[PDB]
């Protein structure tokens, strides 16, 4: 009834385009399907977005507050280290959000440790991969029941 | 003949999207219109542009070289801390400018103190809200006349 | 035994002692029972350990390797910012761990943004209260089966 | 009426010497008159202070309190980057104020990019010559209308 | 059976769009056609792209993996200092690339020294204007064999 | 009826081991007794505790809460620069504390300047030798009124 | 032949102005009036001094030298973080001083953490208020005797 | 004269995942050859390992009263974090040499920093357990 | 038909106030007649001036533009690392200067390694004690003509 | 008076010394004779130089001033990160120069991202192996043409 | 021709040049001799080289490859902090090395804490005087078996 | 009896070489007879040295120690910012030195503000053109008779 919104940042789109071994066989779609499925099983709405354009997401988020979204679960991808606009969009709207990362952002380049969201997020999950999204949703469904 | 171009960076359109409590409550246009009125009365022809997509903001800056725009007023907001490409635009066409900010950026988080445009612009204003926008237009003019 | 060991860093024994507002009421042993139940519903063993003495924790972490623990869910608390011993213990025993925190670590003093653990954990959940422990228990159980 | 004090930092008493093509036409006098004339238009008894001395300005700020001054407009800046005594007086009397710089102060040497006032100041103006004060004073008045 | 994509980033379209000594006659398209012919002379196919938009360049390089582009010659421009997206875009597809800038990155402001791609390209060529492209292409032609 | 607690950190038990060479013949035992007598002669009860283990001090701090201690006069000594656990212990039991140091800390190494306790202590006495304990006691007694 | 000279930095003249607790009723004179009193019952003389000018306190400290002041109790206020002149003044005349701050300096802005005087004072009291002066004086009595 | 060898936390793990990560060598092994090195030089050397700082602190206070002359310490992890260990060492004022099995400089930067190094007589890192012997050979030559 | 002013910053008047050296009796007094003499012996005009008051020193150089002058030799002392008011005071009058210091700036505390006057001076001199002044003067004299 | 001088810095002699692939088989010798052959078709005279001592490179640069070398193509190697002396030399003689590196320098240790040279060069090439030099040449060879006339 | 090659950097040739307990009478020669003696005990062939010219050291490292040296014990002295060319010659010939220093570098000045050679050496010794070269040889000797 | 050694770093040999309007024709050679005549005038022995090779300079600082040079005036040039090797050369020989730079190093790139020498130098003089050497020699000259006494 009250919407959850899952936002995917740049390049998440490329997910799965070179299996066998690089996490071969997993795609941004495979992911959207589970989350959508998990959100359904506990009777809640879930919309997924994706663009390699920062202006496209800032847009979506301005719409999310308008579309009544209650809690955003964002995988800002590379934009989390560079976009304060991605931050002032999620704050300016005042929606709660939980930041999600597939990879352990802390285990990669140091410029990846900085984030423009995690501090205003309810929480942050990184490195649990796809399930990160799942748990993020788990906490979200309860967060406001 | 002349043209002033006020551009607004991301999220600025969200002005007034939840009014209580006693905050301020004004929109992106309450100023756009506050400016255009002030523009013509002094014989100069204004122009405004707003997006959350950096590309757009660049092309509008570019096309200004074709157009013959003499000076720009801009509030890149979030972009001032992040886009040099934006910087490359205003220098690429040799169109002077001014940078304005609604909130007093220096009283917020630290990261908001850096600016990729401030140093190039004729000047900067912040913490006075919309009154800076229009304080700027005032200078834009007394320069051309 | 399919042992997973839950470790709680110092001061966590005080959770729930000015009930109404500060942290509210969720006692260490309240979290312990919860984990034990989840642990048993999955037919997976789970001992727990708390101590205000860092060395008690490292002692426990070693004992865990001896005991064949497959993964540690550690809530180092104040030690995530100050303990390399803790990091090197977990890397010494090569027991993969998930770092978990109740409060959103990135929301407090900048000094709590650093972790001598995070970069080498599988992932990090923070700011999601006791559930953090549970999700961590989920990912963990599903990684062992 | 009700008083606004317009404090000037050290060096603004200088002038426009080597006046043609040094950018030194107008003097402090020419800014202090213009403004006091603008406070006349606002029906406020606006007094000014220029001192190359810190201790004269702080003392001034305390007199201002006892004299129930309502808001201070202050162009420290050779004092903006260096003094907290100035800051602690402007807070210790809790009279609101604004910061103004004739030149764009971010277009210069990197160490001008910091201020001990800007953060606890209502707003900041830099870059637009002495037009900047008139902007401050205007604003200050609407702050009393 | 080979293709070379050439990518021009933001503000590269302005070459020769300001006449006299400001980049003179040489247009982005003169560069394009010469390169096209140099390609053809040695029976290689070659395409060119340019956009002030981050997402667009991001998108088209993904199109490249689909189109079988054996190597990208790219002049990111101002996006080398901001976009970790493009870094994940080029890294994502895995199309070896060459960094080309016309001007000399290092003779400028400190933030230009920082590149999100430099450390991942085959090599960089900056400071040699148009000819920079010809060379990259020359090398790109011999690379494939 | 009121209990004041005085907690001495690691290495403080060493007071009086090389008497004339460094500091003086004064001990923890004197400071303690003179402290008790001053409190008996003021109708306050007072207990004391010293330890070289963060856990014990942490532990004691927790018991002071249950014992109804009204205030802790503490000398964390070295823990002050490294223990965010000690900090969280005092925070977790919310017993006002005054941080005392016999030696003047800022006179020493740069790292001794940082402290995880000073910003949460009611006040800090450092460098005035053992009187800083009497003064803390004295102050704590006026506070106990 | 003992005199004690108490110095009060800029703004301390403002103590006890909005007595309805922006901070309490205790005024600068009260402090001196209780200080001179305490001294006498020990047959010690004691003049005191306050000022908002860097120079005044400097000159003043210089006079203490010729006046044969045994010790100095000083509260530099903000000059503590900005004046190396006050520093070189105190080290210049070499009268040991007890740096006293009514407020726990460490609980405020980062720039207040710094101090150009602490590494050079016998000790520091900060955050214990006016009793801090008596304590300084009490310590200052017995050491001088 | 008594040397006292302190091993910080986790050193009790030496040789516990034998396949060429570490190797077969253990801490008791190191102590064994160390006490031996000591007895060969007619020096009493006591060892102490604890994953507990207070234990290590107390030990060095006891070391004062016992009359210990020099401490060879491998604070391991405690190097980059414990100024209490520093103050304890400084407090009883017993000279010490800092030891580290792996080249700390070829790892993570936070490794690079030591709260003891500047006050130790010297430092040895990257030469494996051999460092205790070197430090002990040095320790011994400072007492004889 | 020129003139030369010499400036001394705070604390200099303290020279030679604790008998044997560390400058045993080279007071500031001495250093002035010495510098004055040398100027009256090559026939140049010049006055000396020392103040523990910043504003006074700043004032004093504005009197430099009122009367004369071609070159200024200055030892700010403590105001070198602190004052940018003094810097712009020199640039504004535009009188080229020579920076001088009695002790070796570079050999003291790090904080003293920063000079606000160094990068604009004609040149700097430090560590040559008194004699340093002597050279500054000397370089000027053979520079006017 | 229309020479091009090519300068190789420290360790560049070692090209192809380990024949098997830590790099290929290419030596400085080959790069030069190719450069010289290339300068001949254009009727341009070119010289080359290499040394592992900063001073010697500083000297040869200074010597190019007197030879009337018109443009210097330089691969400074490790020196770009440490030698402000090499820097003040190319600026000393005011000979434009192109900086070339065989490997992509930004793809390694942080310190290796700094350069006391790149900013004052005409352009920089890095990563392209030997061909990086050819481009410098082909570019230089034109460069002699424009910037007339007289 | 030689199995192990010791390198002594600039200024190590100064050892013992000021003998009466401005350090030990121990020369660089004595150190070479001691090492050589020791190497003859393990039937290892050792060569020594010292110079104040980086190029001579680099050329030597190059000659070292073509000679087939197995390990380099190097005390680059000063050059540890500044030479990447030494780095590049050592890596370039791909010969492993142990780094050595006589004094505790960590006890001296901060700029001495940095090293262009430490991270690629097998190990480093410092503070144990000449004994440090011994320990390294003894270490090298064992490895070459 | 009290000899002064003047050391000029790399590139200083280029002085007086795009003559018509830049700097002067004033050569390093020229600056040297000025210092020589200044030293000779005060009864002080003065030597000079310049090399574009650091190792040549460290060597000479070492020779100065055995030469009994009471004080060194050095224009480390670009080396003041890079050679801690030069710094340790000076500290190890424990010869007091004065640092001279022709230009005002603080008015140039940020990297020119860090000196591996200055904090151990008695003093620094920069910006005063070639006369800085003169003022340094000046101090050096009176600095050889001060309170021991005498």
From Swiss-Prot, chains A, B, C, D, E, F, G, I, K:
GO terms for molecular function: 3-dehydroquinate dehydratase activity. The record marks 18 as: Transition state stabilizer. GO terms for biological process: amino acid biosynthetic process; aromatic amino acid family biosynthetic process; chorismate biosynthetic process; quinate catabolic process. Substrate binds at residues 75, 81, 88, 102-103, 112. The keyword Lyase applies. It catalyses: 3-dehydroquinate = 3-dehydroshikimate + H2O. The active site is at residues 23, 101. It comes from the Bacteria. Its EC number is 4.2.1.10. Pathway: Metabolic intermediate biosynthesis; chorismate biosynthesis; chorismate from D-erythrose 4-phosphate and phosphoenolpyruvate: step 3/7. The keyword Hydrolase does not apply. SUPFAM superfamilies: Type II 3-dehydroquinate dehydratase. Signal peptide: none annotated. Gene3D superfamilies: Dehydroquinase, class II. Keywords: Amino-acid biosynthesis, Aromatic amino acid biosynthesis, Lyase. NCBIfam families: aroQ, PRK05395.1-1, PRK05395.1-2, PRK05395.1-3, PRK05395.1-4. Catalyzes a trans-dehydration via an enolate intermediate. Homododecamer. Belongs to the type-II 3-dehydroquinase family. This is 3-dehydroquinate dehydratase. The gene is aroQ.
UniProtKB/Swiss-Prot annotation, chain H:
Coiled coil: none annotated. GO terms for molecular function: 3-dehydroquinate dehydratase activity. InterPro entries: DHquinase_II, DHquinase_II_CS, DHquinase_II_sf. Signal peptide: none annotated. Substrate binds at residues 74, 80, 87, 101-102, 111. Its EC number is 4.2.1.10. The record marks 17 as: Transition state stabilizer. It comes from the Bacteria. It is an enzyme of class 4 (lyase). GO terms for biological process: amino acid biosynthetic process; aromatic amino acid family biosynthetic process; chorismate biosynthetic process; quinate catabolic process. Keywords: Amino-acid biosynthesis, Aromatic amino acid biosynthesis, Lyase. Pfam families: DHquinase_II (PF01220). The active site is at 22 (proton acceptor), 100 (proton donor). It catalyses: 3-dehydroquinate = 3-dehydroshikimate + H2O. Pathway: Metabolic intermediate biosynthesis; chorismate biosynthesis; chorismate from D-erythrose 4-phosphate and phosphoenolpyruvate: step 3/7. Catalyzes a trans-dehydration via an enolate intermediate. PANTHER family: CATABOLIC 3-DEHYDROQUINASE. Homododecamer. Belongs to the type-II 3-dehydroquinase family. This is 3-dehydroquinate dehydratase. It comes from Acinetobacter baumannii (strain ATCC 17978 / DSM 105126 / CIP 53.77 / LMG 1025 / NCDC KC755 / 5377).
């Amino acid at each position: 009834s009250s919407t959850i919104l899952v936002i995917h940042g740049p390049n998440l789109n490329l997910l799965g385009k070179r299996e066998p071994e690089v996490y071969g066989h997993l795609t941004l779609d495979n992911i959207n399907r589970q989350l959508i499925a998990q959100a359904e099983q506990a009777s809640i709405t879930l919309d997924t977005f994706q663009s390699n354009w920062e202006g496209a997401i800032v847009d979506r988020i301005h719409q999310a507050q308008t579309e009544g979204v209650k809690l955003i679960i964002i995988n800002p991808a590379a934009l989390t280290h560079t976009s304060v606009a991605l931050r002032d969009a999620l704050l300016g709207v005042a929606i709660p959000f939980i930041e999600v990362h597939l990879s352990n952002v802390h285990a990669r380049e140091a410029f990846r440790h900085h984030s423009y969201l995690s501090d205003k997020a309810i929480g942050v999950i990184c490195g649990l991969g796809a399930k990160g999204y799942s748990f993020a949703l788990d906490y979200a469904i309860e967060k406001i029941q």
